[PDB]
Amino acid sequence: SMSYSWTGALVTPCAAEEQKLPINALSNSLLRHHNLVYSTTSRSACQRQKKVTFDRLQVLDSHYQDVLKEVKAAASKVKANLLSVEEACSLTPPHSAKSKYGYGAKDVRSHASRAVAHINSVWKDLLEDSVTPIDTTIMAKNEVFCVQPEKGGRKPARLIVFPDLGVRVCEKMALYDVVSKLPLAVMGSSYGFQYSPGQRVEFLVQAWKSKKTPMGFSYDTRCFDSTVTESDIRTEEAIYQCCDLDPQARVAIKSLTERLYVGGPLTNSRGENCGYRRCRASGVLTTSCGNTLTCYIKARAACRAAGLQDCTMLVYGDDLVVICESAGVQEDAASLRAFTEAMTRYSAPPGDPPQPEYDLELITSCSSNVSVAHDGAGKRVYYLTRDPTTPLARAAWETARHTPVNSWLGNIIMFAPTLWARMILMTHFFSVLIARDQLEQALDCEIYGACYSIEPLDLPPIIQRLHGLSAFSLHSYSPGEINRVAACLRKLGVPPLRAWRHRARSVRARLLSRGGRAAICGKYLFNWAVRTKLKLTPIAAAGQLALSGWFTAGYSGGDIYH
Numbered sequence: 001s002m003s004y005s006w007t008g009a010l011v012t013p014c015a016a017e018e019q020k021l022p023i024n025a026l027s028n029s030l031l032r033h034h035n036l037v038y039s040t041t042s043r044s045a046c047q048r049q050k051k052v053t054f055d056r057l058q059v060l061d062s063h064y065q066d067v068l069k070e071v072k073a074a075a076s077k078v079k080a081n082l083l084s085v086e087e088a089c090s091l092t093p094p095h096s097a098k099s100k101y102g103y104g105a106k107d108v109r110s111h112a113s114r115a116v117a118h119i120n121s122v123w124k125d126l127l128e129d130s131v132t133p134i135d136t137t138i139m140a141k142n143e144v145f146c147v148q149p150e151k152g153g154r155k156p157a158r159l160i161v162f163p164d165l166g167v168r169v170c171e172k173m174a175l176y177d178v179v180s181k182l183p184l185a186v187m188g189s190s191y192g193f194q195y196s197p198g199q200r201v202e203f204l205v206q207a208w209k210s211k212k213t214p215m216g217f218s219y220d221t222r223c224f225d226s227t228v229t230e231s232d233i234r235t236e237e238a239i240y241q242c243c244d245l246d247p248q249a250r251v252a253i254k255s256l257t258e259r260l261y262v263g264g265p266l267t268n269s270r271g272e273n274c275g276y277r278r279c280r281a282s283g284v285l286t287t288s289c290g291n292t293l294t295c296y297i298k299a300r301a302a303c304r305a306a307g308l309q310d311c312t313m314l315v316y317g318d319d320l321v322v323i324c325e326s327a328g329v330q331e332d333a334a335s336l337r338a339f340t341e342a343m344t345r346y347s348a349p350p351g352d353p354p355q356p357e358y359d360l361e362l363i364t365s366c367s368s369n370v371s372v373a374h375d376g377a378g379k380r381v382y383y384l385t386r387d388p389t390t391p392l393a394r395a396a397w398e399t400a401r402h403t404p405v406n407s408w409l410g411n412i413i414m415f416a417p418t419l420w421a422r423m424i425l426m427t428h429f430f431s432v433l434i435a436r437d438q439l440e441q442a443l444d445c446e447i448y449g450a451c452y453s454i455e456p457l458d459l460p461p462i463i464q465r466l467h468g469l470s471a472f473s474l475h476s477y478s479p480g481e482i483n484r485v486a487a488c489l490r491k492l493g494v495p496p497l498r499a500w501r502h503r504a505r506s507v508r509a510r511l512l513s514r515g516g517r518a519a520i521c522g523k524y525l526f527n528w529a530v531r532t533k534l535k536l537t538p539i540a541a542a543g544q545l546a547l548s549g550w551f552t553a554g555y556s557g558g559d560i561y562h
């Protein structure tokens with residue numbers, strides 16, 4: 001069937017939508033080529049609608065069925081509980097889209113009578129009705145990028161589809177424990193979200209070394225969400241139902257599948273009927289879990305049809321990396337084309353055809369890649385990095401305008417060992433916080449989709465736990481990585497690294513003079529900025545922190561707060 005059917009009504013905005021990066025002195029100090037930086041808006045929604053709309057032809061085979069059997073078998077070891085209303089309410093972010101029924105995120109979070117009354121009635125309705133399609137809102141995501149004329153200039157906005165706040169709370173009640181436990185049990189080491197960035201690196205490196213002659217590739221499915229069929233969404237439900245579940249949970253899961261997940265009507269911000277969805281909803285709790293499962297199932301089956309030898313897979317939502325034993329150059333190319341063919345039959349053809357890579361560093365997934373630096377003692381250290389353009393463009397925007405969720409903090413945490421994060425992002429934001437007297441205030445940032453409340457002053461212990469002490473001592477980065485950062489700076493009109501070094505020394509000093517946690521920031525985060533180096537020893541605070549939930553519970557679709 002058609003992934004979507006449209007009425008003609010436009011995807012409409014809620015409030016004013018700034019297109020171009022605002023001129024602000026502090027954002028300008030990071031990035032000056034403001035004309036290159038843009039936010040996607042509802043104005044480009046039609047362009048996206050065209051791309052995401054198509055017929056799905058799906059043909060399953062014995063390899064697929066074999067794999068699905070394995071998955072259902074593994075899922076049967078999982079025991080998931082219902083969350084209570086109160087528990088589900090606290091997993092709601094404060095910034096979450098308000099209900100159409102006279103309450104918002106703040107009210108959910110403080111268990112207000114009108115919110116709980118509606119949530120209970122929505123729950124009752126899920127148990128009583130299993131067929132009536134549930135209403136959803138369609139919105140155009142406002143995301144920031146840098147323009148690329150070479151690649152056809154401005155990207156069209158992504159479409160986010162979500163049900164009302166009340167339903168989203170009920171989703172947590174029914175499924176949060178399932179989406180938290182199931183993927184890991186089913187996929188084991190292939191489940192991407194379990195890994196901290198440091199662990200992810202170690203996993204990729206060992207997988208690479210475990211082959212006599214390694215070959216790797218990434219597979220990018222064109223419009224993964226549109227490729228997910230009704231039957232894929234029902235297969236997911238069948239898999240959820242393999243777990244040991246509460247009776248009410250089973251009813252609610254089945255209702256949410258048939259009334260919400262498989263499809264339903266799309267309403268714009270002005271209440272107009274936009275059309276109907278028959279594919280994955282971007283803004284539901286199960287999006288991340290479901291996409292990972294379906295991708296994994298299709299990929300694992302496709303590996304077999306492709307005749308790939310000794311396959312190690314890493315799956316994060318629609319992001320797939322496979323590392324395997326090479327059969328020869330021509331043999332590998334051949335098997336990769338057969339892989340693509342299998343995936344296509346499974347309804348998930350590529351955006352760009354996958355290419356074999358015989359060097360680990362060349363594999364790009366989730367827009368990241370492995371690279372090499374050296375630690376204090378000159379030992380080789382691997383770490384995850386990425387092209388800094390988008391992180392920098394967003395960082396500038398987020399300086400110019402207050403955004404409820406702050407991606408820059410996420411990037412500092414996620415890419416802490418990197419040259420660009422340490423020298424530019426850290427220096428910049430610590431100088432901005434100092435300038436605005438916001439150094440002690442907690443911020444909301446997203447990590448692997450989940451929304452977190454993080455104090456900037458806790459950055460050092462967080463980094464140590466996620467990346468190790470070496471993250472504060474890396475030097476002698478690779479020439480490729482330096483060149484990529486350099487090229488990014490030129491393109492965006494960001495000051496050069498040495499300029500940042502000077503600034504970082506000043507920031508460091510200001511931080512050290514405040515004592516306490518701020519001193520530790522100055523000491524550990526900016527040790528690179530001075531020749532006369534302080535001794536970096538393990539931080540006590542890191543030990544006295546529990547960071548486990550960080551690499552278990554994250555769903556981009558999910559509206560999750562920790």
Ligand SMILES: CNC(=O)c1c(-c2ccc(F)cc2)oc2cc(N(Cc3ccc(B(O)O)c(F)c3)S(C)(=O)=O)c(C3CC3)cc12
Binds near residue numbers: 196204319320415448
């Ligand atoms: C299947 N691919 C992988 O699982 C990952 C590879 C990869 C790279 C090369 C290779 F050969 C194989 C795999 O790199 C990764 C780096 C990240 N990080 C950043 C990051 C990147 C994008 C998003 B997002 O817009 O969805 C995000 F939320 C975070 S992070 C913090 O550093 O670990 C992640 C995190 C969980 C999403 C996954 C992978």
